[model samples]
Target: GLMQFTLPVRLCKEIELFHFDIGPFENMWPGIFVYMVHRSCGTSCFELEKLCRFIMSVKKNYRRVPYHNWKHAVTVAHCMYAILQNNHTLFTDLERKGLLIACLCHDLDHRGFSNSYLQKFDHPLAALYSTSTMEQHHFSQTVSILQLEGHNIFSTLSSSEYEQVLEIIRKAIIATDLALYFGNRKQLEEMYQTGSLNLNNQSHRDRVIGLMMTACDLCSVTKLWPVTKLTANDIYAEFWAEGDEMKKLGIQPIPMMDRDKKDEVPQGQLGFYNAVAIPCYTTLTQILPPTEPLLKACRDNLSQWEKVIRGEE
Candidate 1:
């Protein structure tokens, strides 16, 4: 890990996230996320030390959870990086900065708990924000990181550009909450499906970008099978851990969170894909053709779960 941490800034910049097996270079994650911001904006604005230290701050803030940790954040940003690499022309330089920053900081200080877990227990963060409690906290934490001395990567940007980026970052981070996805996806789906979608329209562009944030947040759903399974296990470990804590709090955990229901994981994953992943990526591909591989990979992973259910693999 120190080897990765000690690498020259140029080598650090070279730790790529364009490939599928990003897990092998886990220690290089902070570097990759930093590089993405540079590559996307090509901003003479950001200094290397500030960018690097900022990423490390984000990394330090993330809890060592089984999932929803720095690993998940980096992977989500990796998906964002690939999508942007293939389709950067679709967005403004400002949008690019907002997207990558939001992706990497989306789950900062996650505490290994879902928003519902907090709501169920009357956690202060839930009461502090009426909706998307955890996401709002993430946005707040991101802003605080910027306030840190010498950690402002956008230090040289015009004040107007900086404000605009923060607004986009807030929306993008809040967009990661799947609770918003259930209702918004239909609006997004209808826009694309009915041919009413117009990227030239700012409202339309906002929705498209919102949908992209959702896709990146759930990008694990689109990874290949081995990676998918490993991610699933890590996710289950977090859910199960929460399930245990929920009982200690005198709350009833959902089936997916309950370790006793582990035998039903195959079915659980199948339902997840059908309800969330498939529609999200399917519509995304229709709107952004370059995202076709994401949809295909998602369906491919879904089929693997189907096979698991059949005891065939």
Candidate 2:
């Protein structure tokens, strides 16, 4: 077979062969990952356990789609964990754990496609959010699911403590905003060059903490070999489906799926990865060495993609 196997197969293999080998998921879970945040944030073991259970519940609502499956949840969780492991410093245990929890639960009920569908169609979330905070709609949906049905895992906390947890969740979830990627890189670069991080107080520290988690979420280009390439394929299929949907609605399609059939898939995937994912990951690791291995893995995966695309793998 040209592509060899489905993405789930590739991801499962990657997790077993690499991630599990490094640290079994069970050991990596509630203890290291959960405690990592609790110790730093002063979040209690009970509170952290509740949060983990809440996130585990949200995973049930995630629709099985090519780009946003539970595997991606596992992947992001692993990525967030690995990113922290690599960084090794500059982040308190609690900060890393909070970020990990946020990454795990951020995409509850993801409707397969991007926020473009919500905005274009004026979905209920779009109407409620008014596009002013379209990304927040996704974030709120996850939180509300826990609150509305009285599944409030945060219910144990007092009002102020509850609000604080919510605030952490909001910041981490919203930071996954795609449009902000490039602008954020520029800001980080400037901050690094100016040594602005040196004079940081608590507020500054939290912002840096948020940036750390945010970077991990967006660090796909540095993803391990075969993993990044497999995700690229899934994203292409997803975009193609969206393009087809737009065509059916007589909407002006995105430029990536142009008139020429040959140019459509190949050019679209390569251009997006090179121009967007590659540069974003490259620039990100320049300021964070722990990101280097994932980036190297991604760079290696690009070559293998040629074989898959040509049906020679």
Candidate 3:
């Protein structure tokens, strides 16, 4: 609960929250958080400063991994901001605050290793949760930061309201797991096709929030060509790092993680889109029609990946 380090530079910078091109990760943190905290949480300026400090602290805690670093967290937060802004009326204040904060904290302290890798190696985190292993650790990190002195950004909330916010954060963080997404995706699709997805229903809406986390988590796949390609490379770099570790331990890495199978990147990406990104985004569009852009971008990127696969890129 103690923040031992001092920030040498200031935190705030005037920039548009939705501007993805904002200069440094430090500057972008204030921009992205201000809109959500002011609009939904109604924090005082002093409280906002504390919140900003907490965010920067959270950012620093993220390991300098290729993909799951601070920049990736902010990008996912930006996507969540865009989604909430697009459909502001659909979500209550609680939902908006929860989704935004969850996006920022979902990958807190990520060690660039997959849940499977953790399980295979009998990592302490794997023993701790036994299920949703990595996600649970991420959520625990979020909570620890919140509990830190002068870091409880939600301190302004009443006891009941604080409890509500924590509940949302808990569910939202855990929802980022792909294991949960696969099952939730089918349910969302079924509800969409059946016209039974009532946005008013808490259970139904919670599931939608879960899917939103996945959407933003995989936002790279929906980005334009260069960004998508670059992000894929970063992710694969992290995977290759883990693969290298596995080989050092005399364990065979999965094909996608194996650096020797570098040629398989395109096919692996294609499979990810076909299996995960596309289906998830398609289902989301069916419910939130405004999210169609995400689906369209994903489809376009899929074609680009296809070209790469065929050696035509």
Candidate 4:
């Protein structure tokens, strides 16, 4: 089935600003992504075919959940693409590939549950990894797919490049944990403010790559108003589903996740943007001024949420 798929040539180069809301992404993603790998890393035709199949396999692995499904994965990948395009010179060849691949696979097989819920319920996955539970599983799943025959897209890379890519991918994927975002944010902010961020330095570069993953993970929050509205609904739907499950188990969900407080979505979103989205994007823009639009878009979404909060939207 994967062999029959063909990618559109123009979509790859043009996808930097592509808006998925107007069209189906599933049809466009494979070709555009193949193009991304081909152009960014110089993979051959055979390698492109293998990479396409690998992407489809990864997409198939994502659960059919409310928000963290294939569409979300593709969207995050698109954001990573945009980020890389905006500052292509800032990253090494392997760094670009690693970050994009990490974004594409970070939330693989999400089961509509948070880490806290998993730990509270003593879920097997929670027991398997003591920290970054979901992120670790996601990385493992990515590696598992790559190990499949004809799916090892990085097979052609040099031994050192392949190992480095894997390391960067792991760090990038694990960085998606919101629990780690606070420390990352403070560190990034300090480095940017002190002008101590040396992109040529591997340590500093890796830290930026990790933060970029966080930004892309929450990309929708910094998108246009229509995209923000749709994404917000999908996000809260997942949260409400988890809350319902917890309620069924006689556990009281936190207010944001509680289905009973569904109307609070708008206000809750405002808080999220103010407390997390704005500051994160602010730091991103401060370091990469070209990303100012992302900060502006976030504020625009926040304003729309405010109107909704006041019963005006």
Q: Which prediction has the highest lDDT against the true structure?
A: 1
Give residue 154's error in model 3 in angstroms: 0.9
- C-alpha lDDT values of all predictions: 0.83, 0.58, 0.80, 0.81
lDDT (10s digit) by residue, model 3, range 1-116? 22222222332222222224323545645555565456444444226567777888888889988989888887888778777766768987777767778888999999999998
In model 3, pairs of residues that clash are: none
Candidate 2 on 31-74: residue-level lDDT in tens? Answer: 43343344334454345445666656666767777766555555
Each candidate structure's TM-score, on Cα atoms with residue i matched to residue i, is 0.92, 0.74, 0.90, 0.92
lDDT of 1: 0.83
Backbone clashes in model 4, listed as residue pairs: 7-31
Candidate 4 overall lDDT versus native:
0.81
TM-score of model 4 (CA atoms): 0.92
lDDT at residue 232 of model 1 (Cα atoms):
92
Error of 2 at 304 (Å): 4.2
Candidate 3 Cα errors over 4 Å, as ranges: 1-27, 35-46
lDDT of 4 by residue, 279-302 (tens): 988988887777777788888888
Give candidate 1's error at residue 21 in angstroms: 3.0
